[PDB]
Amino acid sequence: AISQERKNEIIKEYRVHETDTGSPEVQIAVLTAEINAVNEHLRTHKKDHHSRRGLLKMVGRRRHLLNYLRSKDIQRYRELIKSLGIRR
RNA sequence: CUACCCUUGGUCAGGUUGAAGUUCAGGUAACACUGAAUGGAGGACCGAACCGACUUACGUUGAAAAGUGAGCGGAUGAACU
RNA sequence: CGGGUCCUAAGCUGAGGCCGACAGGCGUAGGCGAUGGAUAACAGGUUGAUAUUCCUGUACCACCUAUA
RNA sequence: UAAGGAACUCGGCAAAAUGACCCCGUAACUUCGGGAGAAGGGGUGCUCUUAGAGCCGCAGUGAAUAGGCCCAAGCGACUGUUUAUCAAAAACACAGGUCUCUGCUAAACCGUAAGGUGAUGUAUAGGGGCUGACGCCUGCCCGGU
RNA sequence: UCCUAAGGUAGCGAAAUUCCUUGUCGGGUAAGUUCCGACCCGCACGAAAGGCGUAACGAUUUGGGCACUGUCUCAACGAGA
RNA sequence: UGAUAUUGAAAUUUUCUAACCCGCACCACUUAUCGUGGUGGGAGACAGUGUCAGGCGGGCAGUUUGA
RNA sequence: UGCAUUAGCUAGUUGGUAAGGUAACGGCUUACCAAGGCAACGAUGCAUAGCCGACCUGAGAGGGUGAUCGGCCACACUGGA
RNA sequence: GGGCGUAAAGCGCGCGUAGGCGGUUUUUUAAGUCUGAUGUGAAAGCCCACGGCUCAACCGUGGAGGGUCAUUGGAAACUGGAAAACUUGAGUGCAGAAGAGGAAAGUGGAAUUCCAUGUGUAGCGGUGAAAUGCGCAGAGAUAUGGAGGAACACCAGUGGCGAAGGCGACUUUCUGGUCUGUAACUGACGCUGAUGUGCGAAAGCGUGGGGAUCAAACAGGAUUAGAUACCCUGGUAGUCCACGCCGUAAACGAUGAGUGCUAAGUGUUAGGGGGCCCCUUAGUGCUGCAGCUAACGCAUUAAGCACUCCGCCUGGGGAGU
RNA sequence: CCGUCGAAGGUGGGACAAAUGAUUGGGGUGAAGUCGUAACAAGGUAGCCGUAUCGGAAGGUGCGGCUGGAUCACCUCCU
RNA sequence: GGAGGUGACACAUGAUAUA
RNA sequence: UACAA
Ligand SMILES: [K+]
Ligand SMILES: [K+]
Ligand SMILES: [K+]
Ligand SMILES: [Mg+2]
Ligand SMILES: [Mg+2]
Ligand SMILES: [Mg+2]
Ligand SMILES: [Mg+2]
Ligand SMILES: [Mg+2]
Ligand SMILES: [Mg+2]
Ligand SMILES: [Mg+2]
Ligand SMILES: [Mg+2]
Ligand SMILES: [Mg+2]
Ligand SMILES: [Mg+2]
Ligand SMILES: [Mg+2]
Ligand SMILES: [Mg+2]
Ligand SMILES: [Mg+2]
Ligand SMILES: [Mg+2]
Ligand SMILES: [Mg+2]
Ligand SMILES: [Mg+2]
Ligand SMILES: [Mg+2]
Ligand SMILES: [Mg+2]
Ligand SMILES: [Mg+2]
Ligand SMILES: [Mg+2]
Ligand SMILES: [Mg+2]
Ligand SMILES: [Mg+2]
Ligand SMILES: [Mg+2]
Ligand SMILES: [Mg+2]
Ligand SMILES: [Mg+2]
Ligand SMILES: [Mg+2]
Ligand SMILES: [Mg+2]
Ligand SMILES: [Mg+2]
Ligand SMILES: [Mg+2]
Ligand SMILES: [Mg+2]
Ligand SMILES: [Mg+2]
Ligand SMILES: [Mg+2]
Ligand SMILES: [Mg+2]
Ligand SMILES: [Mg+2]
Ligand SMILES: [Mg+2]
Ligand SMILES: [Mg+2]
Ligand SMILES: [Mg+2]
Ligand SMILES: [Mg+2]
Ligand SMILES: [Mg+2]
Ligand SMILES: [Mg+2]
Ligand SMILES: [Mg+2]
Ligand SMILES: [Mg+2]
Ligand SMILES: [Mg+2]
Ligand SMILES: [Mg+2]
Ligand SMILES: [Mg+2]
Ligand SMILES: [Mg+2]
Ligand SMILES: [Mg+2]
Ligand SMILES: [Mg+2]
Numbered sequence A: 001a002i003s004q005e006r007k008n009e010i011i012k013e014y015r016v017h018e019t020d021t022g023s024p025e026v027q028i029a030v031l032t033a034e035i036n037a038v039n040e041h042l043r044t045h046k047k048d049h050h051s052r053r054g055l056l057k058m059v060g061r062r063r064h065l066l067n068y069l070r071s072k073d074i075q076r077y078r079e080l081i082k083s084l085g086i087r088r
Numbered sequence B: 001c002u003a004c005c006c007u008u009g010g011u012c013a014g015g016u017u018g019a020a021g022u023u024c025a026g027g028u029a030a031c032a033c034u035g036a037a038u039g040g041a042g043g044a045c046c047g048a049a050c051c052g053a054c055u056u057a058c059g060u061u062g063a064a065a066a067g068u069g070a071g072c073g074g075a076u077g078a079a080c081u
Numbered sequence C: 001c002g003g004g005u006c007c008u009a010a011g012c013u014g015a016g017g018c019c020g021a022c023a024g025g026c027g028u029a030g031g032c033g034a035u036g037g038a039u040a041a042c043a044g045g046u047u048g049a050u051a052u053u054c055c056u057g058u059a060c061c062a063c064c065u066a067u068a
Numbered sequence D: 001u002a003a004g005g006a007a008c009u010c011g012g013c014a015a016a017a018u019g020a021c022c023c024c025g026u027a028a029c030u031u032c033g034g035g036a037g038a039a040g041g042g043g044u045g046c047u048c049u050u051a052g053a054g055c056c057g058c059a060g061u062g063a064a065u066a067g068g069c070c071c072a073a074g075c076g077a078c079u080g081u082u083u084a085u086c087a088a089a090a091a092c093a094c095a096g097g098u099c100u101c102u103g104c105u106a107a108a109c110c111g112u113a114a115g116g117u118g119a120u121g122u123a124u125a126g127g128g129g130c131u132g133a134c135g136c137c138u139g140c141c142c143g144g145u
Numbered sequence E: 001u002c003c004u005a006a007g008g009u010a011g012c013g014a015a016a017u018u019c020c021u022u023g024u025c026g027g028g029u030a031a032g033u034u035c036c037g038a039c040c041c042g043c044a045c046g047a048a049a050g051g052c053g054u055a056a057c058g059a060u061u062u063g064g065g066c067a068c069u070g071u072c073u074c075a076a077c078g079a080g081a
Numbered sequence F: 001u002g003a004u005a006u007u008g009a010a011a012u013u014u015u016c017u018a019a020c021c022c023g024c025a026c027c028a029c030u031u032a033u034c035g036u037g038g039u040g041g042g043a044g045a046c047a048g049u050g051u052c053a054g055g056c057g058g059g060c061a062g063u064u065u066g067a
Numbered sequence G: 001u002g003c004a005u006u007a008g009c010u011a012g013u014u015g016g017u018a019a020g021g022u023a024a025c026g027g028c029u030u031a032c033c034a035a036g037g038c039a040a041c042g043a044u045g046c047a048u049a050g051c052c053g054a055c056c057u058g059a060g061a062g063g064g065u066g067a068u069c070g071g072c073c074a075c076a077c078u079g080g081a
Numbered sequence H: 001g002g003g004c005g006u007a008a009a010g011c012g013c014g015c016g017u018a019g020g021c022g023g024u025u026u027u028u029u030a031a032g033u034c035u036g037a038u039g040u041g042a043a044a045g046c047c048c049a050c051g052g053c054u055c056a057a058c059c060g061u062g063g064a065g066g067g068u069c070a071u072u073g074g075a076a077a078c079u080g081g082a083a084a085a086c087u088u089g090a091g092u093g094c095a096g097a098a099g100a101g102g103a104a105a106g107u108g109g110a111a112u113u114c115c116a117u118g119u120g121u122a123g124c125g126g127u128g129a130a131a132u133g134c135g136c137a138g139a140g141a142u143a144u145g146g147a148g149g150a151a152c153a154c155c156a157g158u159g160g161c162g163a164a165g166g167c168g169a170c171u172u173u174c175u176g177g178u179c180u181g182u183a184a185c186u187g188a189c190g191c192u193g194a195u196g197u198g199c200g201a202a203a204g205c206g207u208g209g210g211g212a213u214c215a216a217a218c219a220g221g222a223u224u225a226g227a228u229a230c231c232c233u234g235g236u237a238g239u240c241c242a243c244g245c246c247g248u249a250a251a252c253g254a255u256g257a258g259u260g261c262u263a264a265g266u267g268u269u270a271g272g273g274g275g276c277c278c279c280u281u282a283g284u285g286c287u288g289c290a291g292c293u294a295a296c297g298c299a300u301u302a303a304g305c306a307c308u309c310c311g312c313c314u315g316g317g318g319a320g321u
Numbered sequence I: 001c002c003g004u005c006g007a008a009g010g011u012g013g014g015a016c017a018a019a020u021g022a023u024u025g026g027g028g029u030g031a032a033g034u035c036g037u038a039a040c041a042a043g044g045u046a047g048c049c050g051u052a053u054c055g056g057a058a059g060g061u062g063c064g065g066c067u068g069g070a071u072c073a074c075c076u077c078c079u
Numbered sequence J: 001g002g003a004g005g006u007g008a009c010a011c012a013u014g015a016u017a018u019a
Numbered sequence K: 001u002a003c004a005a
């Protein structure tokens, strides 16, 4: 869905420190771009159920990371919520 | 006159109902979906004008060679003129 | 003022033209044809009988002639 | 108009009853729109205070005008149309269905023809036959015509 | 068994079709040749001269009930032409 | 539907063009979706039309359908 | 205690203020204000049932019963004071 | 104090909410847990002891028992609450690799059917045997060309991919997942999953296209005592496409998911490390111990040994009514 | 004496529940009367599952699936 | 040798218990 | 064998 160049752009922007690729903020931001791209694919490929199943897993993984971030530090969580186009 | 049509005009008191859309709100990953408001559709509803003629009474050397009285059907439409 | 001296609709008619025993039928250009388009005046007074028409006051339109 | 209340009659024909506005409340069935004004019930006068307190009559939309309602069955889906002048209907039409003809100077129709309609349209179009919303469906026979 | 091209599927049925006939049974009535629901013995239903149903609609046809009444028992009085 | 006339030219049904036809395009008459001519294109001795013939023909007509 | 083949219930309802009322607190009652309160941890509705010490059974864990004796409640032909 | 491969019993399969459950360590707390104190758990009853009834029933007296009870003082291992660390679980990054995973649009070869043309003549077709059927108006056969729909030989393999249903010509575009290595990173972020929400062979349904082959129904021909069949000749829906619906199958491994542990041998698929072999991951098969099983059998892909969560069963018929 | 609240009663339309109703549907049991012979063997067309359709009936046929299918082949695997 | 994949005319019927 | 037909 997204290139390694676009992924590295997102990692650079949302990392909480240098050499960070595994924080919730980095993962949620990358998952958000991937979810948006597959939604773009599914708008002209409505019958692609198999791809849509993979999108549903990304949405579930993002929601779990968001729940963990919210319960650990709500300040980091609410700043990430506005940065992306995410409600809750 | 009447039937149908052509061209060009005109007319339809007031009430009632509340379609599609839209917006806001919930809701979603994105749609579906839902409520409120808005909106004003319909050979839609009730009912004058108007157009009819279902029932009944009267009239039947008529007021009238087809009518009158009382109700009755349609009444933004395939309307009436 | 309404109509004509303006415009076209349906329709009618139709120089030439096409068709048809005859008589005639159709039709092109064009023409006629309002129920539509265009278009300059109002208020008051007056008679037995007319009135945006007569009369009074105040206008507007088209055309003509002269100064411009 | 006593008492009765459809016993009248082919048939409740005619008449009586209902009726306005405001507020409650409303069934089977349903194509989810409806059915529905379903049904069934409450309130209306006048005066005073700012919803209460009073006043009067037999009666308060005090006159006139203003849906009767319910249950079930046949037919037709529906609005519409018809025998001017004894029939308005279950008849006609209808949206929908199907069959069939028609390649365009189309087929079909009027006309002797010319000229036209079809159509200033072109098979998602035009003419003709039958059926008649919608739902579920539409079996057998091609010997004869 | 005979014959045919083939001998009526689903659904419906005393029906706007049933002659016998007021068929028979049930419901409704005190009493119902009409009505409703069933049966099938369909004189002589039957699938686009469509079959079976169907919410909504009807001055349609048919049966029942409430309200209501001079329709009636059974007529009487009054107003006017 | 056939013959024949309009109706010709070559092969063996095919070909051709020149009669006939075009509710085919452009041009002129001409401010004209008529018409008439001109040029292209299509079609073509077919079609259309005349005469003759056979067939179908309640679409329409005249009649009959006894005592 | 059953039943989800019972999922929505409530509008004095839930809270507040004031007054009234009671032996007493209290929506207990009324007036005004606000829109709360309950529920899948089963609200609500329907059905069933007086509850307990005890009693019967069982190795026990459990299952079954509430006559007699004792505690508590409710009722006194039905309903309202 | 039971089960769910074949006896009744694993939802067809995902995603996921509530809930249940949850890796290592330190500090802290004290709800659960443990341990005393106090109060209370009436009397009668039951049980033990003793006394009175001639005995016994029975009666009486003294004890014991019965709470998930409350209040209060201690303990701190485990469960829970708070705080702080951790990297093994789970994710991310980086480096490789394989794949009929999915959606869309294009290109191609064989064959079937139909159509035309040329040659060419008497049958072709079909069965157990036949007949229906097609054919002298030229079939069938043969050669060439065209139209059209459908499906993709060989490759092809207890091979591969996918949650399952499923996925097989080739090309491009869009896109999902998995595996191996590394140890940058985050630091338990996990597992399961009622309700829910989605996907789901074939048949079937709606609208509209398409229509080669095959083929319910149906017709004819056979067979047969009959033949509403099996066989033959045809043939409609359907089979194909798009968009909706339906939500079911012996949807099967008749075996729910997760995690760990427990002999070996031997094929195969995709990788990695080291010297064709040895080691090692992850799949996919066969054989086979321990163990399990009623037996059959299963056996590191468990039906073994364990913990967590879900679904389901409780004799047969009636009745999945 | 007047008004608000007030049981019972009456009026109305619905909700629910139990009884019964011409006729009607399927089931169980009893007996084997009748018609066939569908399954069990390759049960004489392998059977079963879903679905569709047809038929006196068991059942047939189509499409997909399963082996919980007999007999004989050609291959992978194991011993 | 044993498995797993692959492929490959007609024949109706026979009551109840007790066996 | 006792039955059934
Ligand atoms: K007019
Ligand atoms: K037509
Ligand atoms: K014929
Ligand atoms: Mg007027
Ligand atoms: Mg109307
Ligand atoms: Mg009206
Ligand atoms: Mg009229
Ligand atoms: Mg009148
Ligand atoms: Mg009306
Ligand atoms: Mg003329
Ligand atoms: Mg005058
Ligand atoms: Mg009277
Ligand atoms: Mg009276
Ligand atoms: Mg009365
Ligand atoms: Mg009478
Ligand atoms: Mg009488
Ligand atoms: Mg009347
Ligand atoms: Mg009124
Ligand atoms: Mg009608
Ligand atoms: Mg009408
Ligand atoms: Mg008349
Ligand atoms: Mg009349
Ligand atoms: Mg008709
Ligand atoms: Mg014939
Ligand atoms: Mg008769
Ligand atoms: Mg008929
Ligand atoms: Mg027919
Ligand atoms: Mg017919
Ligand atoms: Mg009809
Ligand atoms: Mg009346
Ligand atoms: Mg008089
Ligand atoms: Mg005649
Ligand atoms: Mg004559
Ligand atoms: Mg005579
Ligand atoms: Mg009781
Ligand atoms: Mg026991
Ligand atoms: Mg057991
Ligand atoms: Mg299990
Ligand atoms: Mg079994
Ligand atoms: Mg089983
Ligand atoms: Mg399973
Ligand atoms: Mg299943
Ligand atoms: Mg004693
Ligand atoms: Mg990579
Ligand atoms: Mg991979
Ligand atoms: Mg899970
Ligand atoms: Mg579930
Ligand atoms: Mg299908
Ligand atoms: Mg066949
Ligand atoms: Mg289809
Ligand atoms: Mg589809």
Ligand SMILES: [Mg+2]
Pocket: none
């Ligand atoms: Mg199962």
Ligand SMILES: [Mg+2]
Pocket: none
């Ligand atoms: Mg397991």
Ligand SMILES: [Mg+2]
Pocket: none
């Ligand atoms: Mg395990």
Ligand SMILES: [Mg+2]
Pocket: H288, H299
């Ligand atoms: Mg083994």
Ligand SMILES: [Mg+2]
Pocket: none
């Ligand atoms: Mg292995």
Ligand SMILES: [Mg+2]
Pocket: I037, I038, I043
């Ligand atoms: Mg058999």
Ligand SMILES: [Mg+2]
Pocket: none
């Ligand atoms: Mg068999």
Ligand SMILES: [Mg+2]
Pocket: I054, I060, I061
């Ligand atoms: Mg069959």
Ligand SMILES: [Mg+2]
Pocket: none
């Ligand atoms: Mg399968």
